[PDB]
Design a protein around this ligand. Structure first.
Ligand code: DHE
Ligand code: DHE
Ligand code: HEC
Ligand code: HEC
Lengths: 539, 538
């Protein structure tokens, strides 16, 4: 009873300032659930689970009820020229459905489940123990030249032989794998689906097989392996969209070790954000750390794995909406993009600080970027954009080129906006740029190629989807990817689930069609990752 | 283009995202009546989001599972495991208990957040550092000044140690919880449970407030940088709500950084939406702050060498971290995980957890009592709320590795409800209060042990009786020494409409020495001697 009186006083919190949420328009279970289904299929990706993910005002009840039924139905119907699509004018949703959505966003956001250690371990499986695994490569495949390709809708991935252009093995994975990464030893291929399910693949088995699996959240996009000297296959890290967290696992078995929440204060307004999605993750070569990108709060975390029992995290503030990115030629500066902020953040991994914030085009989307030596400006890193057809070239040499370091030194012009990936290779004199989400079909089905030896000349357009000879379908071309020796660049002809797709290979030296990969199993091919280039960050 | 890029379906399954309800309808006045009772009477233990107490949380999934009558029966008779009986005792009516049962079946109302805009709005520089004196402009013996908390008055009082007279009363935040000193010994920092901080300059003609700021809706702790070369550099405060801490300029109180403590627990490793910040202590080994996060049981080492890019080492300990203090050497932070009945040892030099020592029912050491035991070498002690024991823990890894991090011995006091144990380098006595003991006589007195003869039973000093105050609970709390170490002060924490006092004792003879009374001395709780607080002398 002593301890009961000890903690018996009043909370300093004023009841009058703790508010009950409601005053929303009534809707039955049938109605409520219909809107909710529409919400996650059509709105969630941009607005988030708790409705604070997009730019502009959040869709939380304090704002929506203020605007009211009429204003909301009107906005959802026509959209806005700032990124909010029109759902009525386009015919996407009915007026009845839009009325449902306007009612829906006036209610408190339904809560998705959390996903801690018990859920994680439950989902964790070791298909093949480290003791039962081969001591050496048991197949005669040229693993470095293998291409891990995502059969998106199929929920699988395909290993494709670089030289033979044939599918060696198809593997079952999590739905719509987003990226593929290689372990520092070059033996394990890691893949993670948007459903947060990670699969570990042993390339040394007679036939490449899965040795371990785990689910690290409800939704996810990234995975990475420890690449610091003396830590080959030590730790594997993965970031989730929901819950706002990342998890560190055992490199050999994928055993859950640490789970860290990214919920926190933003870099810009320094206010609490309840859902800071984890974006890109890259492993440091300077220190035993993982460089994690936290989107909404716009934070770059340096997570030290030298001692995972007592995690040390350095939080570097950058700019809101961090997404993708990659290393500079030297592998010390993490050139990442804050897309909605129209900036590229530069993270000095050695000194562990924000080297600079570079102003670029509308909605930069570099992927891992493209590094090359410019005749006049020296070592540069480049990116294309979704908001425009420009290509930003940034100087990346502080030591021997202070005049150009962290400056948008020059621009190039491609086919137009809607670009996703820019590419090049050390042995190549060409720079590729795609246009996957360009509203023009011809431009979306082709790629622009620049001449590094003559950057003044306009690009050449390579008709990739046409070369494929596929037939009907949108046939969107996406992500150029070189092979081991960088003498051929690969592309994905991302056609529908019920249509026909292909991977088109081009001779880098002649810019001529070299081959086309077709297979009934090659369903919705998207990302392609060449083992050697992925593992050694060659781009 | 960007609209098609981010146009695919989210990987989250709509069928697993749940709408809350199925709660008993209650009008606006009924919900508000319940909500008021909940923060006046329940929140302290259960918390804002109802996940702060042991046992099952009071969230809709559980409360609706138990049902209306189960809840009414539980709130009415309580449980032997820490849940008070509100009906049986007669505290709440059956009509109110019915409202409470219905209330916790609804989603928890949400309190506002509190970020940088709110912080800067509340931030006030009263006297600019340039406009402040360059020397001490008064004749006060600052090191022997006591900062006393006049709880219900929302003020503190500076009492001259030798004269026993109130030197100045200052308006502060409501119910200040602790007083802390800047490393230079010039500024006094106080923080109210309402999260309002006040910085006081002791060098001014009359010690006065130079700055103030509010770092949350509810808080308890504050601290200053004590690493060499960092005097008055930064000030840190921990909040209960929102679940966070903030770092500010140690000269102006300007908010610089705010860090959320919401996260994963150390035991179950699941997400906890409300991990309150408990004690905070400044490191002498590195340029860091050692922060306790209660519910997740984490001790964070927040480095301030580069305040722009904050680096935090997260150390797991045990759930329900609360109060704690240094060992005689000032390298090991001895902190109590009260509900876990353990004392965590954080090595601030090597930056790791040295041990988890099993102690008694609900440890509550305050900052603890350090003293060299004649047999077991240097130890750090603590008393409890749950029982009448006093744990003695060895703290000497070098010269006494056999006793290091072991509950080496045990002393017995008057009983439970204890809150503070105390001693001093120059003293040979060990004091222990028993503030929340259900017996009036025990709670109005303190026990004293002879450190030169620990086998001998304690003496009982009738502190409240010595005060001669008349009616009231007259609960005595927290022993405190003067700089010389020859006087020990106690607070007679009576009601606000009653008479209170500060009883001072001759440590050398254990005889009454002085009694401080004043119409202004309302509900005197914590007392912090300037020097002893600044140099962590305990
Ligand atoms: C955070 C993130 C990364 C960086 C990973 C890293 O390196 O750690 C990334 C990379 C990638 C990469 C990496 C390529 C590389 O060369 O590194 C690929 C292939 C890719 C295929 C697609 N991405 Fe990606 N992508 C998102 C997020 C991300 N994508 C989205 O949230 C978004 C905007 C919406 C969505 O529906 O997921 C999105 C849409 C797409 C697509 O439309 C693609 C083409 C097909 C798909 O599966 O949705 N994203
Ligand atoms: C986190 C915390 C600390 C350590 C801070 C530090 O050292 O940096 C502390 C210390 C303290 C100290 C520090 C003394 C010391 O020697 O360091 C004092 C005097 C004190 C007076 C009280 N505390 Fe305290 N206390 C709480 C929290 C805390 N108290 C509570 O939440 C609790 C259990 C419930 C409440 O009502 O707030 C509580 C009740 C009390 C009381 O009942 C006291 C006697 C009067 C009051 O104002 O509530 N607390
Ligand atoms: C990204 C590709 C989006 C998708 C898909 C949807 N919305 Fe959106 N929405 C988006 C942006 C960037 C903005 C900002 C608009 C601006 O000009 O500032 C919005 C805004 C809204 C709003 C208005 C909020 C307000 O200002 O009060 C609403 C009500 C809204 N969006 C609704 C909504 C719904 C119901 C959607 C799916 C059916 C949806 N959005 C999808 C970006 C995107
Ligand atoms: C601490 C001093 C408390 C105060 C004040 C109140 N409660 Fe409590 N409560 C407390 C504990 C430690 C526990 C666990 C007890 C156990 O034996 O497990 C509880 C539990 C409850 C419950 C039952 C929860 C369940 O198991 O379903 C209820 C319904 C409950 N407490 C309600 C509640 C209310 C409404 C209170 C204020 C009027 C309240 N508690 C105060 C600790 C504390």
């Amino acid at each position: 009873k002593a301890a009961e009186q000890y903690q018996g006083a009043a909370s300093a919190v004023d009841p009058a300032h703790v508010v009950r949420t409601n005053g929303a328009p009534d809707m039955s279970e049938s109605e409520f659930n219909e809107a909710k289904q529409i919400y996650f299929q059509r709105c969630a990706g941009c607005h988030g689970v708790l409705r604070k993910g997009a730019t502009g005002k959040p869709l939380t009840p304090d704002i929506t009820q203020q605007r009211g039924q009429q204003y909301l139905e009107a906005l959802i119907t026509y959209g806005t020229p700032l990124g909010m699509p029109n759902w009525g004018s386009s015919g996407e949703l009915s007026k009845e459905q839009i009325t449902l959505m306007a009612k829906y966003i006036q209610h408190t956001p339904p809560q998705p489940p959390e996903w801690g250690m018990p859920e994680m371990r439950e989902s964790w499986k070791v298909l093949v123990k480290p003791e039962d695994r081969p001591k050496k490569q048991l197949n005669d495949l040229d693993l470095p030249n293998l291409f891990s390709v995502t059969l998106r809708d199929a929920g699988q991935i395909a290993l494709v032989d670089g030289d033979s252009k044939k599918i060696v093995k198809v593997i079952d994975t999590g739905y719509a794998v987003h990226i593929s990464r290689m372990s520092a030893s070059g033996r394990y291929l890691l893949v993670i689906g948007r459903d947060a399910r990670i699969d570990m693949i042993d390339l040394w088995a007679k036939e490449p097989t899965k040795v371990a699996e785990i689910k690290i959240g409800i939704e996810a996009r990234s995975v990475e392996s420890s690449k610091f000297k003396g830590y080959e296959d030590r730790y594997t890290i993965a970031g989730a969209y929901w819950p706002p967290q990342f998890a560190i696992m055992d490199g050999e078995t994928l055993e859950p070790k640490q789970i860290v929440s990214t919920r926190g204060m933003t870099v810009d307004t320094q206010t609490y954000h309840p859902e800071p999605r984890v974006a890109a993750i890259i492993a440091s070569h300077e220190h035993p750390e993982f460089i994690v990108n936290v989107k909404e709060t716009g934070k770059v975390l340096l997570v030290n794995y030298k001692d995972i029992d007592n995690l040390t995290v350095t939080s570097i503030g950058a700019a809101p909406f961090l997404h993708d990115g990659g290393w500079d030629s030297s592998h010390r500066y993490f050139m990442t993009a804050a897309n909605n902020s129209n900036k590229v953040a530069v993270i000095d991994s050695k000194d562990r600080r924000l080297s600079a914030l570079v102003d670029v085009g509308k909605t930069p989307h570099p992927g891992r970027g493209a590094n090359f030596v410019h005749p006049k400006y020296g070592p540069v890193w480049s990116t294309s954009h979704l908001g425009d057809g420009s290509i930003s070239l940034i100087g990346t040499d502080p030591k021997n080129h202070p005049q150009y370091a962290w400056k948008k030194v020059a621009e190039l012009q491609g086919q137009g906006g809607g670009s996703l990936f820019i590419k090049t290779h050390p042995k190549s004199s060409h720079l590729y740029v795609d246009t996957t989400f360009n509203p023009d079909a011809r431009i979306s089905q082709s790629v622009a190629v620049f001449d590094l030896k003559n950057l003044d000349a306009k690009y050449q357009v390579l008709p990739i989807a046409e070369w494929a000879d596929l037939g009907e379908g949108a046939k969107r071309v996406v992500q150029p990817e070189y092979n081991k020796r960088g003498d051929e660049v690969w592309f994905s002809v991302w056609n529908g689930k019920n249509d026909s797709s292909a991977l088109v290979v081009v001779d880098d030296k002649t810019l001529k069609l070299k081959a086309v990969v077709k297979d009934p199993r090659l369903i919705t091919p998207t990302g392609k990752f060449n083992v050697y280039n992925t593992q050694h960050d060659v781009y």
